[PDB]
C-alpha cells in the first residue's frame, strides 16, 4: 500500500507547535518524488540524504511531525538551532537524518480580527530534549514566590497565543510544517 501522506500534508487542521502531532508511518511504499515535484513548498530541505536518492532507500519506521509556527520561526526547525520554538516547543537533534518541509498557510490559518487557536510555549525552566513534547499547563513561577495555579505578577500561564491576521507580514504569518524522520517496512 501507499503511505498516508495525503492525510498528513492535506490535513484540515494542524496542531499547535507545543503539542506537535506525530504520525508513525510503516508497512507501505512511499513515493517521495511526488512531494518534491510539487513546487508548492517554500521550505523543503533535507539533512542527511538527498530527496531524489532517498526514493531509492528503505527504513524501519518513518515519523511525520506536523505543527504551525511563524514564518520567521521556520529557521528554528533544523539541527542545532536556538529560539523559543527550538528551545521550548520542538527540538531536532544535532545528528538529525530526515527532511523539514514547510509552506505558507495564511489563507487557511489566519482570520480577520485574529486567529488564536494556535499556541506556543513561551515560558519554560529548561531546554527541550530532541523530539520532546511538552503539554503541561502549570503556571510558570518567574519569581521567588510560589505561583500556586493562579496567575499574576511573576506567575504566568506558560502557553501564549499566536495572533494570525491576514494582514501580517509574511514572516509573521502562519506556516504549516511537516518533519519526516527516518530511522525495514517503508520503501519506494
Amino acid at each position: 500500500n501507499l503511505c498516508p501522506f495525503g492525510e498528513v500534508f492535506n490535513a484540515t487542521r494542524f496542531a499547535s507547535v507545543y503539542a506537535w502531532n506525530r504520525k508513525r508511518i510503516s508497512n507501505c511504499v512511499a513515493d517521495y518524488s511526488v512531494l518534491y515535484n510539487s513546487a508548492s513548498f517554500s521550505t523543503f530541505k533535507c539533512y542527511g540524504v538527498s530527496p531524489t536518492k532517498l526514493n531509492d532507500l528503505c527504513f524501519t519506521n518513518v515519523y511525520a511531525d506536523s505543527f504551525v509556527i511563524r514564518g520567521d520561526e521556520v529557521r528554528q526547525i533544523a539541527p542545532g538551532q536556538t529560539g523559543k520554538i527550538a528551545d521550548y516547543n520542538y527540538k531536532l537533534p544535532d545528528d538529525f537524518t530526515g527532511c523539514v518541509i514547510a509552506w505558507n498557510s495564511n489563507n487557511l490559518d489566519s482570520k480577520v480580527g485574529g486567529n488564536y487557536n494556535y499556541l506556543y510555549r513561551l515560558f519554560r525552566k529548561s531546554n527541550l530534549k530532541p523530539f520532546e513534547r511538552d503539554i503541561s499547563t502549570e503556571i510558570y513561577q518567574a519569581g521567588s514566590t510560589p505561583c500556586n495555579g493562579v496567575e499574576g505578577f511573576n506567575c504566568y500561564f506558560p502557553l501564549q497565543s499566536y495572533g494570525f491576521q491576514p494582514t501580517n507580514g509574511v514572516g509573521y504569518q502562519p506556516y504549516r510544517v511537516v518533519v519526516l524522520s527516518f530511522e525495514a517496512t517503508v520503501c519506494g
Partner: antibody
Amino acid sequence: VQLVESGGGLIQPGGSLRLSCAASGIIVSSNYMTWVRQAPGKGLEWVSVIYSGGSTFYADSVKGRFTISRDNSKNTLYLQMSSLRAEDTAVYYCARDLGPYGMDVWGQGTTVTVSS
Amino acid sequence: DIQLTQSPSFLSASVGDRVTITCRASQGISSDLAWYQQKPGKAPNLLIYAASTLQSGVPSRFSGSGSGTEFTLTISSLQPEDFATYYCQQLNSDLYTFGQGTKLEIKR
C-alpha cells in the same frame, strides 16, 4: 522587586568591562533578561538576551564583543564588554522581557564612558 | 526586521490637552506593540502592551489603539508629569525594534 545595576566607568578604547545586574524578587535564572543601551539623544538600542534555558542572542553591533552570563547563586545578571569602542559610550540598562506582555521591570542604568 | 516610524518626533501642548502619538509599522505586526515613557534622568516605563492593554499601575488618561501597521498613543488630559519622551516597540521581535521616540514639550 527591583534590578540594581553597577560596575561601569571610564574604560580605554579596546579594553574590557563587566556590568552586573543584581536582581530582587525576580529570578534571572527563570526569566528572559534583557540589556539595552541608550546614547544621548540617540534612543533605545537592544543588545542581547539570555533565555530561561541558556540561549543567548545578540545585536549584530555587539556580536563577537559582548557576552551574557548569569549566576544562579548570586542571582546576578552580567554583561561582559570587550574590544570596546567609543560608540558604546552610553547608559546600559537591564530589563525583564515578558514577550507579548512587554518589558515591565527596568533597572536604573550604569553609565559606561569609553575614550582616549 | 520591521521599521517603526514614530510620527511627531517633537510635540508641544498645554496641560489639560489631549495629544496623540503615532507609531507606524512597515509590514504589519497585528497588535504586538508596546509603549514606554522615559522621564529625564530615569529608565523607560512600560505603559501599554498588546497595542491597547494598560499596564497595571498606569493612570487611565493613557490609552493605546491600533492593529496592523498604524498605532496611536492617546493621553486624555495632559498633566505636568506627562511631559517626557515616549517610545513604541514591536513585541515578539527577534531584534527588539524600538522607535525613534517622541518628545513632549510645553506649548508657548
